[PDB]
Design a protein around this ligand. Structure first.
Ligand SMILES: *[C@@H](C)[C@@H](O)CCCOCCOC(=O)CCCC[C@@H]1SC[C@@H]2NC(=O)N[C@@H]21
Lengths: 214, 228
RNA sequence: GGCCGCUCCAGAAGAGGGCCCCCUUGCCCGUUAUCGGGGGCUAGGCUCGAUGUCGGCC
């Protein structure tokens, strides 16, 4: 019987100088045998804290750890620019060791509505037998957005995939693609292809659409 | 006294296949450590795989790799190994080697205090294939605030990665190349887009340059607006 | 009634085992390894005890 480590929230936005707290709940008691790691994209984790609250050698003193029952907290007292990263908790009270799913600390900025664009499939692609319809959400903040596909006013499910960039290094926004993949046969069975976008920066949902063949 | 862990041996294998990972350590003795393999699937968290104490030979394994994976160590080389047999797609991950320092004054192993750079393991039955590159064309209907969007759909390639530039690197501002998605076919697909002034469309040329080293492919696609 | 005993019955019978919690390992301890002390439970299902509502002897 393993001990699970549940981390929340999955991500949070903060600004340089903020006090940041990240929490991790053990499914049962681990005493103080909890470690905290920092991981930057494409890099190996680094140990920050062990035994719940003990700072590992060389780790800056703005990092601290605490325990309340099964809830473990990592606190950054004044966030620095090098602290935007993902943080993982881990227990070692009982084998196998187990990790929380991570908390990504991201950069806060002002709300920005997406600019939305829809792309019909190219004739080149249609000739090969497939029809990818792409909907682009450009330079928006925050990350939360809902993209809905409608084909001849019918809500689509299960036939689309989303991909989202990491926060832009210059303006801290996200961009997102949602790709609707139909066979050429299915794509020719319908006329109106519509991408509908909901986001906090928009007073009401934005819809971009086209008619096949126009 | 600089601790280093250098992983090697990762690569692409078919389901059912085998790979041996190596973790070459310096700056400390393997017999004064617990050595670990921890893996991270793309976009996911950390999953412990196996541990070994080279001093005693004691080993432990995640349930899902027992019988398939063997962790070992050669103290004469200060190197730890992960022999991975019967690999399957769900084992695809970056594999990290990590160390826990032994402290004779302590009474149990503590946290993972140093991690290597990681080695990538991809398990897939897909065959190497260069991408098909299709235009994402701007339309007159689609101009917002003096800005147009265009791009390239880079579809059905294997394995990762592709790189995309625009106008041979001359166009960098406003470019977004999205993370690849693994399609149910086992092939990858991504789009690269850029926003540009709409008034430029008649007097500028926009070309996406797609590179897929595994298939030795370099493809240039001119993306131009369609008329009516 | 008496003595001897658990080889079968009874659960009227307590330890082993197992689960949880506190104490930053906290008398002494600790397998290159997570303890110790305290607290909250689990009983007749296995082992070993003990018992008689059991068996033998007189
Ligand atoms: C023996 C000391 C222990 O079993 C008794 C605990 C003392 O407390 C009295 C309450 O007894 C129990 O509740 C313990 C239940 C018996 C456990 C045994 S262990 C082997 C067998 N397998 C299993 O799962 N239960 C029984």
């Amino acid at each position: 019987s393993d001990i699970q480590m549940t981390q929340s929230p999955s991500s949070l936005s903060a600004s340089v100088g903020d006090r940041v707290t990240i929490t991790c709940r053990a499914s049962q008691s681990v005493y103080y045998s909890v470690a905290w790691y920092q991981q930057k994209p494409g890099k190996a984790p680094k140990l920050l804290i062990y035994s719940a609250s003990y700072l590992y050698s060389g780790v800056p003193s703005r990092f601290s750890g605490s325990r309340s029952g099964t809830d473990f907290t990592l606190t950054i007292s004044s966030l620095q620019p090098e602290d935007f990263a993902t943080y993982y908790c881990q227990q070692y009270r009982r084998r196998p060791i187990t990790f929380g799913q991570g908390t990504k600390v991201e950069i806060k900025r002002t709300v920005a509505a997406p600019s939305v664009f829809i792309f019909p499939p190219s004739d080149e692609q249609l000739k090969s037998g497939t029809a990818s319809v792409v909907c682009l959400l450009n330079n928006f903040y925050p990350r939360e957005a809902k993209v809905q596909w409608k084909v001849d006013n019918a809500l689509q499910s299960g036939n689309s995939q989303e991909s989202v960039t990491e926060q832009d290094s210059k303006d801290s926004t996200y961009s997102l693609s949602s790709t609707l993949t139909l066979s050429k046969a299915d794509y020719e069975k319908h006329k109106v292809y519509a991408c509908e976008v909901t986001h906090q920066g928009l007073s009401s949902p934005v819809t971009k659409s086209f008619n096949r063949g126009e | 006294s600089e601790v280093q862990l250098v992983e090697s041996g990762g690569g692409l294998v078919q389901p059912g296949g085998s790979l041996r990972l190596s973790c070459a350590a310096s700056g400390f003795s393997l017999s004064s450590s617990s050595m670990h393999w921890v893996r991270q699937a793309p976009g996911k968290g950390l999953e412990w795989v196996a541990s070994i104490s080279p001093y005693s030979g004691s080993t432990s394994y995640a349930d899902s790799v027992k019988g398939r994976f063997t962790i070992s160590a050669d103290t004469s080389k200060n190197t730890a190994y992960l022999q991975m047999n019967s690999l399957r797609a769900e084992d695809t991950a970056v594999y990290y080697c990590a160390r826990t320092k032994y402290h004779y004054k302590n009474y149990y192993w503590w946290a993972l205090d140093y991690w290597g750079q990681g080695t990538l393991v991809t398990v897939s039955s897909a065959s190497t294939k260069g991408p098909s590159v299709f235009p994402l064309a701007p339309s007159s209907k689609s101009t917002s605030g003096g800005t147009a969007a265009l791009g390239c759909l880079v579809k059905d390639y294997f394995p990762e990665p592709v790189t995309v530039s625009w106008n041979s690197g001359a166009l960098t501002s406003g470019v977004h190349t999205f993370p690849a998605v693994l399609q149910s076919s086992g092939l990858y697909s991504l789009s690269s887009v850029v926003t540009v002034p709409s008034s430029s469309l008649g007097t500028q040329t926009y070309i996406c340059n797609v590179n897929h080293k595994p298939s030795n492919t370099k493809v240039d696609k001119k993306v131009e607006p369609k008329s009516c």
